[PDB]
């Protein structure tokens, strides 16, 4: 059509994930490929693209379609003359044990739109991105890319970053207090280590600034409501604005460089919770922070700032001048601070006596403590009790995705890893295509068992079991 | 009585060893920021320039004995209060109310398991 969709595209567009719709979509999706080969065996139906350039496999991954995705990856057409359209190939079976070759042609970072890329980089307006990492050839592919060449690099990124915050702490702790900020450099062994510690701290601050600025502009354009999806990357960019903010103030002869550097230190150590994802039980703790600093704390700090600025306007209107730790509490800033201390647990009734009408002054403080210390802070605990029960299940789904983006970004950063990114490549011969040729398609492997049924298998690639680097193919193959 | 002491050995290795890593990031995060601010004597009296004292003065906000304006030897009062108010909201309001919710989930899990562990610890 005008959009570029063909028949196999439109069956994906008209899916809506319900188990009745998954039945007759994949049934009708099956019948067209076979009938495509009977009329046109020279045609390859699923290579075709629309004007966005997506294949019907990747279109099911770009949207949230899970049943159409689980079908195409686990696709075997058992009947002969149209078996080359399969994707899941069982290789041998020895009673219970059932070994299968999944296929990795369009997926696994080989092409322009691989479904491992398109799932992870999707803008979260498409649902069920977390669900689409549960299918079988993907969920054992990311787990088996982590166990070699990515666990070694991710532990090295976390070690260099911890050597960055020890240098940037110590170079800021021992800063000169003497005078105006472009400081001369004495010939000591102390000042050589310090000005080295500053140059290694600015150059780290440029690195987080450039990887920020390619994430927003050169790749991945992002709208304003998407900054709760890209939360973990926004914090590494705000840090690099303060650290480069100090270098402007440092050479502008301004003493306010210690007001921007310090917010980079406090945000520097705090962003070390970015690396505690990729660990399972640690990672569910830091997911709940980014889900409850935008949901439960931003709602609570609106209601709390109504009550605090409600009653601390009432109290300053009461208390008069000196009238006769001493301080004039007539400022609105002091009395908004003295009523914050009731929440913190350091709460001083009778903090002043410069008022008049003692009866209404105590009633205001006692109506404040019951509203704020007794009621809201015991409602916040109950509402976090409901939120943690909800995102107990969701956070396992978000953690697997936050493991997957690490694996993709490491592959894009190295060309020699891309020739090592062929996880279980093996370039295996699988079957026989039309025009009488070998298959030669990159294939993965898996193992299962079955005991409820008797495990009857119609087609088996290798008649003789096991994988000992020597096989003989079965005569079950037609050609 | 025995179901009470099983929950201690299951939550001094699971819930407290995870919490005391995140808490020691925030406490050593902000108490590095504060010592970099506060300058020398410049003119309960004490020199708060040590990292040990200021890591202790920010522990006291968790314990419920929390003194804002614990020093005045700094400069830039506006950034000193913002650091303390971003600390108290992060630590006293957010994490300690997340710890109560996460112990609420753990006790519901090991309510059933602890009857099973008690019979073994009797055996
Ligand atoms: C007194 C105390 C003693 C301590 C002495 C300290 C002196 C040494 C200090 C050194 C730190 C100074 C460098 C600053 C740059 C920042 C580095 C960084 O953290 O970024 C990355 C490093 O991963 C990389 O790819 C960059 C590698 C850095 C160059 C290596 C040279 C130093 C090696 C050192 C070891 C030599 C071993 C030799 C070989 C075995 C990791 O971060 P990221 O996760 O990629 O960024 C977030 C990504 N995100 C934005 C998408 C979320
Ligand atoms: C593994 C975990 C632990 C690791 C431990 C790591 C090392 C541990 C320790 C390390 C150093 C121990 C200190 C010895 C020297 C003390 C100096 C002194 O007494 O004079 C004075 C400094 O006045 C100066 O300007 C002199 C500068 C010399 C200090 C050396 C800088 C540190 C190295 C650069 C970084 C390395 C870069 C590496 C590059 C490759 C004393 O300073 P102050 O009175 O405290 O001023 C505070 C100012 N404030 C309160 C206003 C904020
Ligand atoms: C110069 C100073 C540099 C220091 C930093 C250099 C560090 C370099 C790297 C260090 C990495 C440490 C080695 C990890 C190797 C095994 C991984 C693993 O078992 O995965 C499991 C962890 O699952 C969890 O949730 C347990 C958490 C343990 C990891 C420790 C957290 C970070 C502490 C670090 C402190 C940083 C200090 C902060 C900054 C000073 C996940 O598998 P599972 O499904 O859960 O299976 C359960 C099996 N189990 C029973 C074993 C749990
Ligand atoms: C002088 C005047 C001061 C006040 C004017 C400033 C207000 C100007 C405008 C502000 C607009 C919001 C800015 C706050 C950032 C929060 C992020 C966000 O909104 O995205 C969240 C959208 O989900 C929601 O918005 C609903 C849940 C939070 C309610 C937001 C109310 C905050 C307004 C008062 C804030 C004051 C706090 C501090 C006060 C200083 C996404 O996070 P989530 O967890 O995925 O959402 C739940 C799931 N859900 C999408 C299915 C629903
Ligand atoms: C300067 C650098 C400082 C940091 C470097 C030190 C880190 C070096 C390495 C440390 C490795 C661990 C040592 C802590 C002892 C805990 C016991 C344990 O791990 O066994 C537990 C394994 O289960 C788990 O590990 C997952 C749940 C806890 C996560 C552990 C993170 C602690 C790392 C930060 C600790 C810092 C705390 C204090 C900070 C001073 C068994 O208990 P469980 O309840 O049966 O497990 C849950 C059930 N499960 C098995 C099914 C999952
Ligand atoms: C952390 C918060 C920071 C906030 C913002 C701070 C902003 C930036 C902070 C400070 C920048 C101010 C200094 C910039 C240039 C001055 C000259 C200089 O120092 O270079 C010197 C090398 O000094 C080195 O040692 C550089 C080594 C590079 C990295 C080493 C390991 C990699 C060389 O200088 P020179 O002219 O050749 O002198 C003759 C050599 N002589 C002295 C031995 C006789
Ligand atoms: C959260 C989104 C941030 C986005 C990135 C933006 C950051 C990138 C660039 C930054 C350039 C540096 C910032 C301000 C410029 C000068 C420094 C300064 O004056 O600090 C002021 C407030 O400074 C702040 O309050 C920081 C604002 C962030 C608040 C975060 C909430 C937690 C306080 O100092 P002062 O009192 O006004 O100075 C007067 C000195 N006198 C007291 C001696 C008279
Ligand atoms: C959890 C965090 C809390 C912790 C503490 C936070 C504390 C921060 C809270 C507040 C900031 C404190 C500073 C304010 C200034 C008061 C000081 C003073 O002396 O008064 C002065 C100003 O006079 C007034 O300010 C009158 C008050 C008008 C209130 C208008 C409401 C604003 C709506 C807001 C919506 C919020 C609603 C909430 C909904 C989200 C009078 O003196 P002056 O003579 O005019 O001086 C001028 C000198 N000159 C003439 C030479 C130029
Ligand atoms: C909302 C939840 C919390 C409610 C808590 C319950 C109330 C909280 C606290 C209440 C009493 C606090 C002050 C009492 C004594 C203090 C001394 C003082 O200076 O008071 C002065 C005025 O005070 C009065 O004597 C008038 C009492 C009016 C109280 C209104 C009760 C309705 C509250 C409904 C709720 C003088 O008092 P005096 O010098 O001692 O002599 C009395 C002379 N006279 C009787 C003629 C006036
Ligand atoms: C809940 C429990 C908390 C309760 C309180 C706990 C408090 C404990 C917290 C901390 C211990 C307190 C003691 C430290 C020493 C500071 C004192 C001082 O005066 O500075 C001195 C050292 O200078 C420095 O120490 C600079 C700071 C280096 C920071 C390096 C980061 C370490 C990473 C850690 C990873 C952790 C991250 C967390 C992740 C798990 C400067 O003075 P000097 O001149 O050098 O003196 C030498 C004299 N001489 C020259 C003759 C020999
Ligand atoms: C993140 C959650 C918590 C946020 C809580 C909210 C903020 C917390 C508290 C905020 C105010 C605390 C200090 C105000 C008065 C103290 C006296 C002082 O010495 O201040 C000095 C500098 O202070 C200023 O007057 C500059 C105000 C910059 C505040 C930045 C607001 C953005 C916070 C975004 C968040 C001088 O002030 P002054 O002598 O009184 O005269 C003013 C003269 N002038 C105006 C020309 C400079
Ligand atoms: C960019 C945002 C939205 C943000 C920037 C700063 C100012 C922040 O305050 C907030 C607002 C705020 C202020 C006070 C209390 C709660 C929230 O939340 C984060 C932001 C949030 C936190 C708390 O969250 C974290 O940093 C932990 C964290 C968890 C997961 C992550 O992936 C992560 O990034 C790696 C960081 C700590 C601060 O960054 C911090 O160090 C300081 C001084 C203030 C915190 O604004
Ligand atoms: Na108290």
PDB file of N, CA, C and O and ligand atoms in Angstrom, chain A residues 162 165-167 169-171 173-174 269 272, chain B residues 20-29 31-32 35 49-60, ligand 10:
ATOM      1  N   UNK A 162      35.490   3.925  39.800  1.00  0.00           N
ATOM      2  CA  UNK A 162      35.809   4.071  41.216  1.00  0.00           C
ATOM      3  C   UNK A 162      37.204   4.636  41.419  1.00  0.00           C
ATOM      4  O   UNK A 162      37.505   5.178  42.482  1.00  0.00           O
ATOM      5  N   UNK A 165      36.445   8.544  41.124  1.00  0.00           N
ATOM      6  CA  UNK A 165      35.862   9.285  42.229  1.00  0.00           C
ATOM      7  C   UNK A 165      36.804   9.371  43.415  1.00  0.00           C
ATOM      8  O   UNK A 165      36.612  10.212  44.287  1.00  0.00           O
ATOM      9  N   UNK A 166      37.822   8.517  43.480  1.00  0.00           N
ATOM     10  CA  UNK A 166      38.814   8.673  44.537  1.00  0.00           C
ATOM     11  C   UNK A 166      39.788   9.789  44.182  1.00  0.00           C
ATOM     12  O   UNK A 166      40.249  10.534  45.053  1.00  0.00           O
ATOM     13  N   UNK A 167      40.068   9.968  42.894  1.00  0.00           N
ATOM     14  CA  UNK A 167      40.931  11.067  42.480  1.00  0.00           C
ATOM     15  C   UNK A 167      40.193  12.391  42.580  1.00  0.00           C
ATOM     16  O   UNK A 167      40.727  13.380  43.090  1.00  0.00           O
ATOM     17  N   UNK A 169      37.633  13.133  44.459  1.00  0.00           N
ATOM     18  CA  UNK A 169      37.433  13.498  45.860  1.00  0.00           C
ATOM     19  C   UNK A 169      38.678  14.139  46.445  1.00  0.00           C
ATOM     20  O   UNK A 169      38.612  15.209  47.059  1.00  0.00           O
ATOM     21  N   UNK A 170      39.826  13.495  46.256  1.00  0.00           N
ATOM     22  CA  UNK A 170      41.044  13.923  46.925  1.00  0.00           C
ATOM     23  C   UNK A 170      41.592  15.201  46.305  1.00  0.00           C
ATOM     24  O   UNK A 170      42.210  16.017  46.992  1.00  0.00           O
ATOM     25  N   UNK A 171      41.339  15.421  45.021  1.00  0.00           N
ATOM     26  CA  UNK A 171      41.804  16.652  44.401  1.00  0.00           C
ATOM     27  C   UNK A 171      40.903  17.820  44.749  1.00  0.00           C
ATOM     28  O   UNK A 171      41.282  18.979  44.565  1.00  0.00           O
ATOM     29  N   UNK A 173      39.178  17.849  47.891  1.00  0.00           N
ATOM     30  CA  UNK A 173      39.350  18.008  49.331  1.00  0.00           C
ATOM     31  C   UNK A 173      40.536  18.903  49.646  1.00  0.00           C
ATOM     32  O   UNK A 173      40.453  19.764  50.522  1.00  0.00           O
ATOM     33  N   UNK A 174      41.648  18.719  48.943  1.00  0.00           N
ATOM     34  CA  UNK A 174      42.872  19.460  49.209  1.00  0.00           C
ATOM     35  C   UNK A 174      42.998  20.710  48.362  1.00  0.00           C
ATOM     36  O   UNK A 174      44.120  21.110  48.039  1.00  0.00           O
ATOM     37  N   UNK A 269      29.371  10.553  43.539  1.00  0.00           N
ATOM     38  CA  UNK A 269      29.325   9.312  44.299  1.00  0.00           C
ATOM     39  C   UNK A 269      27.971   8.648  44.211  1.00  0.00           C
ATOM     40  O   UNK A 269      27.884   7.423  44.243  1.00  0.00           O
ATOM     41  N   UNK A 272      27.058   6.139  41.365  1.00  0.00           N
ATOM     42  CA  UNK A 272      27.655   4.823  41.429  1.00  0.00           C
ATOM     43  C   UNK A 272      26.602   3.755  41.672  1.00  0.00           C
ATOM     44  O   UNK A 272      26.904   2.566  41.603  1.00  0.00           O
TER      45      UNK A 272
ATOM     46  N   UNK B  20      22.956  -1.236  53.706  1.00  0.00           N
ATOM     47  CA  UNK B  20      24.116  -0.516  54.213  1.00  0.00           C
ATOM     48  C   UNK B  20      25.166  -0.302  53.135  1.00  0.00           C
ATOM     49  O   UNK B  20      26.206   0.298  53.401  1.00  0.00           O
ATOM     50  N   UNK B  21      24.938  -0.793  51.921  1.00  0.00           N
ATOM     51  CA  UNK B  21      25.788  -0.363  50.818  1.00  0.00           C
ATOM     52  C   UNK B  21      25.259   0.916  50.197  1.00  0.00           C
ATOM     53  O   UNK B  21      26.030   1.813  49.851  1.00  0.00           O
ATOM     54  N   UNK B  22      23.943   0.999  50.019  1.00  0.00           N
ATOM     55  CA  UNK B  22      23.330   2.177  49.416  1.00  0.00           C
ATOM     56  C   UNK B  22      23.415   3.357  50.364  1.00  0.00           C
ATOM     57  O   UNK B  22      23.665   4.493  49.948  1.00  0.00           O
ATOM     58  N   UNK B  23      23.260   3.100  51.656  1.00  0.00           N
ATOM     59  CA  UNK B  23      23.334   4.168  52.638  1.00  0.00           C
ATOM     60  C   UNK B  23      24.748   4.702  52.781  1.00  0.00           C
ATOM     61  O   UNK B  23      24.942   5.896  53.014  1.00  0.00           O
ATOM     62  N   UNK B  24      25.752   3.844  52.636  1.00  0.00           N
ATOM     63  CA  UNK B  24      27.122   4.323  52.753  1.00  0.00           C
ATOM     64  C   UNK B  24      27.594   4.993  51.476  1.00  0.00           C
ATOM     65  O   UNK B  24      28.663   5.606  51.456  1.00  0.00           O
ATOM     66  N   UNK B  25      26.830   4.877  50.393  1.00  0.00           N
ATOM     67  CA  UNK B  25      27.097   5.705  49.223  1.00  0.00           C
ATOM     68  C   UNK B  25      26.602   7.123  49.466  1.00  0.00           C
ATOM     69  O   UNK B  25      27.313   8.098  49.204  1.00  0.00           O
ATOM     70  N   UNK B  26      25.392   7.258  50.015  1.00  0.00           N
ATOM     71  CA  UNK B  26      24.820   8.587  50.210  1.00  0.00           C
ATOM     72  C   UNK B  26      25.524   9.332  51.327  1.00  0.00           C
ATOM     73  O   UNK B  26      25.734  10.542  51.231  1.00  0.00           O
ATOM     74  N   UNK B  27      25.885   8.631  52.400  1.00  0.00           N
ATOM     75  CA  UNK B  27      26.529   9.290  53.528  1.00  0.00           C
ATOM     76  C   UNK B  27      27.928   9.737  53.169  1.00  0.00           C
ATOM     77  O   UNK B  27      28.377  10.792  53.616  1.00  0.00           O
ATOM     78  N   UNK B  28      28.645   8.938  52.386  1.00  0.00           N
ATOM     79  CA  UNK B  28      29.984   9.334  51.986  1.00  0.00           C
ATOM     80  C   UNK B  28      29.935  10.164  50.717  1.00  0.00           C
ATOM     81  O   UNK B  28      30.923  10.799  50.336  1.00  0.00           O
ATOM     82  N   UNK B  29      28.784  10.190  50.054  1.00  0.00           N
ATOM     83  CA  UNK B  29      28.612  11.122  48.957  1.00  0.00           C
ATOM     84  C   UNK B  29      28.494  12.549  49.443  1.00  0.00           C
ATOM     85  O   UNK B  29      29.275  13.414  49.056  1.00  0.00           O
ATOM     86  N   UNK B  31      28.882  13.787  52.574  1.00  0.00           N
ATOM     87  CA  UNK B  31      29.864  14.273  53.540  1.00  0.00           C
ATOM     88  C   UNK B  31      31.218  14.493  52.899  1.00  0.00           C
ATOM     89  O   UNK B  31      32.160  14.904  53.574  1.00  0.00           O
ATOM     90  N   UNK B  32      31.367  14.149  51.627  1.00  0.00           N
ATOM     91  CA  UNK B  32      32.510  14.639  50.871  1.00  0.00           C
ATOM     92  C   UNK B  32      32.215  16.019  50.307  1.00  0.00           C
ATOM     93  O   UNK B  32      33.104  16.873  50.211  1.00  0.00           O
ATOM     94  N   UNK B  35      32.578  18.782  53.374  1.00  0.00           N
ATOM     95  CA  UNK B  35      33.906  19.139  53.870  1.00  0.00           C
ATOM     96  C   UNK B  35      34.655  19.980  52.846  1.00  0.00           C
ATOM     97  O   UNK B  35      35.458  20.849  53.201  1.00  0.00           O
ATOM     98  N   UNK B  49      36.679  20.363  60.039  1.00  0.00           N
ATOM     99  CA  UNK B  49      37.317  20.136  58.747  1.00  0.00           C
ATOM    100  C   UNK B  49      37.707  18.684  58.538  1.00  0.00           C
ATOM    101  O   UNK B  49      38.088  18.311  57.427  1.00  0.00           O
ATOM    102  N   UNK B  50      37.662  17.862  59.575  1.00  0.00           N
ATOM    103  CA  UNK B  50      37.972  16.458  59.383  1.00  0.00           C
ATOM    104  C   UNK B  50      36.827  15.781  58.656  1.00  0.00           C
ATOM    105  O   UNK B  50      35.672  16.186  58.775  1.00  0.00           O
ATOM    106  N   UNK B  51      37.158  14.765  57.867  1.00  0.00           N
ATOM    107  CA  UNK B  51      36.120  13.985  57.212  1.00  0.00           C
ATOM    108  C   UNK B  51      35.416  13.083  58.211  1.00  0.00           C
ATOM    109  O   UNK B  51      34.265  12.694  58.002  1.00  0.00           O
ATOM    110  N   UNK B  52      36.076  12.768  59.323  1.00  0.00           N
ATOM    111  CA  UNK B  52      35.454  11.894  60.306  1.00  0.00           C
ATOM    112  C   UNK B  52      34.322  12.591  61.043  1.00  0.00           C
ATOM    113  O   UNK B  52      33.284  11.979  61.309  1.00  0.00           O
ATOM    114  N   UNK B  53      34.506  13.862  61.400  1.00  0.00           N
ATOM    115  CA  UNK B  53      33.456  14.566  62.126  1.00  0.00           C
ATOM    116  C   UNK B  53      32.236  14.783  61.252  1.00  0.00           C
ATOM    117  O   UNK B  53      31.106  14.597  61.703  1.00  0.00           O
ATOM    118  N   UNK B  54      32.442  15.130  59.988  1.00  0.00           N
ATOM    119  CA  UNK B  54      31.314  15.471  59.137  1.00  0.00           C
ATOM    120  C   UNK B  54      30.609  14.220  58.630  1.00  0.00           C
ATOM    121  O   UNK B  54      29.421  14.256  58.305  1.00  0.00           O
ATOM    122  N   UNK B  55      31.308  13.088  58.588  1.00  0.00           N
ATOM    123  CA  UNK B  55      30.600  11.836  58.349  1.00  0.00           C
ATOM    124  C   UNK B  55      29.813  11.426  59.574  1.00  0.00           C
ATOM    125  O   UNK B  55      28.876  10.632  59.475  1.00  0.00           O
ATOM    126  N   UNK B  56      30.182  11.948  60.739  1.00  0.00           N
ATOM    127  CA  UNK B  56      29.439  11.634  61.949  1.00  0.00           C
ATOM    128  C   UNK B  56      28.257  12.573  62.119  1.00  0.00           C
ATOM    129  O   UNK B  56      27.198  12.160  62.594  1.00  0.00           O
ATOM    130  N   UNK B  57      28.416  13.840  61.725  1.00  0.00           N
ATOM    131  CA  UNK B  57      27.335  14.809  61.860  1.00  0.00           C
ATOM    132  C   UNK B  57      26.215  14.540  60.874  1.00  0.00           C
ATOM    133  O   UNK B  57      25.097  15.024  61.055  1.00  0.00           O
ATOM    134  N   UNK B  58      26.502  13.816  59.797  1.00  0.00           N
ATOM    135  CA  UNK B  58      25.444  13.457  58.867  1.00  0.00           C
ATOM    136  C   UNK B  58      24.875  12.087  59.170  1.00  0.00           C
ATOM    137  O   UNK B  58      23.855  11.705  58.595  1.00  0.00           O
ATOM    138  N   UNK B  59      25.530  11.320  60.032  1.00  0.00           N
ATOM    139  CA  UNK B  59      24.894  10.105  60.508  1.00  0.00           C
ATOM    140  C   UNK B  59      23.783  10.433  61.483  1.00  0.00           C
ATOM    141  O   UNK B  59      22.803   9.693  61.580  1.00  0.00           O
ATOM    142  N   UNK B  60      23.891  11.570  62.165  1.00  0.00           N
ATOM    143  CA  UNK B  60      22.956  11.889  63.230  1.00  0.00           C
ATOM    144  C   UNK B  60      21.595  12.296  62.694  1.00  0.00           C
ATOM    145  O   UNK B  60      20.635  12.403  63.458  1.00  0.00           O
TER     146      UNK B  60
HETATM  147  C1  LIG C  10      27.249   4.027  59.207  1.00  0.00           C
HETATM  148  C2  LIG C  10      28.680   4.290  59.716  1.00  0.00           C
HETATM  149  C3  LIG C  10      29.119   5.757  59.527  1.00  0.00           C
HETATM  150  C4  LIG C  10      29.500   6.422  60.866  1.00  0.00           C
HETATM  151  C5  LIG C  10      30.831   7.215  60.813  1.00  0.00           C
HETATM  152  C6  LIG C  10      31.918   6.544  59.939  1.00  0.00           C
HETATM  153  C7  LIG C  10      33.132   7.482  59.713  1.00  0.00           C
HETATM  154  C8  LIG C  10      34.259   6.798  58.904  1.00  0.00           C
HETATM  155  C9  LIG C  10      34.434   7.399  57.493  1.00  0.00           C
HETATM  156  C10 LIG C  10      35.651   7.710  57.023  1.00  0.00           C
HETATM  157  C11 LIG C  10      36.919   7.482  57.876  1.00  0.00           C
HETATM  158  C12 LIG C  10      37.377   8.767  58.609  1.00  0.00           C
HETATM  159  C13 LIG C  10      38.923   8.919  58.632  1.00  0.00           C
HETATM  160  C14 LIG C  10      39.478   9.307  57.235  1.00  0.00           C
HETATM  161  C15 LIG C  10      40.613  10.362  57.350  1.00  0.00           C
HETATM  162  C16 LIG C  10      40.047  11.809  57.365  1.00  0.00           C
HETATM  163  C17 LIG C  10      40.628  12.659  58.529  1.00  0.00           C
HETATM  164  C18 LIG C  10      41.565  13.776  58.010  1.00  0.00           C
HETATM  165  O1  LIG C  10      41.938  14.638  58.735  1.00  0.00           O
HETATM  166  O2  LIG C  10      41.979  13.758  56.659  1.00  0.00           O
HETATM  167  C19 LIG C  10      43.310  13.368  56.514  1.00  0.00           C
HETATM  168  C20 LIG C  10      43.400  12.342  55.375  1.00  0.00           C
HETATM  169  O3  LIG C  10      42.846  12.928  54.205  1.00  0.00           O
HETATM  170  C21 LIG C  10      41.756  12.213  53.641  1.00  0.00           C
HETATM  171  O4  LIG C  10      41.311  11.264  54.197  1.00  0.00           O
HETATM  172  C22 LIG C  10      41.140  12.681  52.302  1.00  0.00           C
HETATM  173  C23 LIG C  10      39.857  11.888  51.962  1.00  0.00           C
HETATM  174  C24 LIG C  10      40.180  10.717  51.003  1.00  0.00           C
HETATM  175  C25 LIG C  10      38.896  10.060  50.446  1.00  0.00           C
HETATM  176  C26 LIG C  10      39.239   8.764  49.676  1.00  0.00           C
HETATM  177  C27 LIG C  10      37.968   7.918  49.417  1.00  0.00           C
HETATM  178  C28 LIG C  10      38.086   6.513  50.063  1.00  0.00           C
HETATM  179  C29 LIG C  10      37.074   5.504  49.457  1.00  0.00           C
HETATM  180  C30 LIG C  10      36.309   4.737  50.571  1.00  0.00           C
HETATM  181  C31 LIG C  10      35.133   3.897  49.999  1.00  0.00           C
HETATM  182  C32 LIG C  10      33.818   4.083  50.814  1.00  0.00           C
HETATM  183  C33 LIG C  10      32.576   4.304  49.903  1.00  0.00           C
HETATM  184  C34 LIG C  10      31.308   3.630  50.485  1.00  0.00           C
HETATM  185  C35 LIG C  10      30.890   2.380  49.674  1.00  0.00           C
HETATM  186  C36 LIG C  10      30.599   1.163  50.580  1.00  0.00           C
HETATM  187  C37 LIG C  10      44.156  14.604  56.188  1.00  0.00           C
HETATM  188  O5  LIG C  10      45.055  14.834  57.261  1.00  0.00           O
HETATM  189  P1  LIG C  10      46.653  14.386  57.063  1.00  0.00           P
HETATM  190  O6  LIG C  10      47.519  15.625  57.027  1.00  0.00           O
HETATM  191  O7  LIG C  10      46.812  13.622  55.766  1.00  0.00           O
HETATM  192  O8  LIG C  10      47.131  13.397  58.322  1.00  0.00           O
HETATM  193  C38 LIG C  10      48.270  12.560  58.127  1.00  0.00           C
HETATM  194  C39 LIG C  10      49.347  12.921  59.204  1.00  0.00           C
HETATM  195  N1  LIG C  10      50.741  12.525  58.797  1.00  0.00           N
HETATM  196  C40 LIG C  10      51.056  13.227  57.533  1.00  0.00           C
HETATM  197  C41 LIG C  10      51.863  12.827  59.720  1.00  0.00           C
HETATM  198  C42 LIG C  10      50.754  11.058  58.610  1.00  0.00           C
END
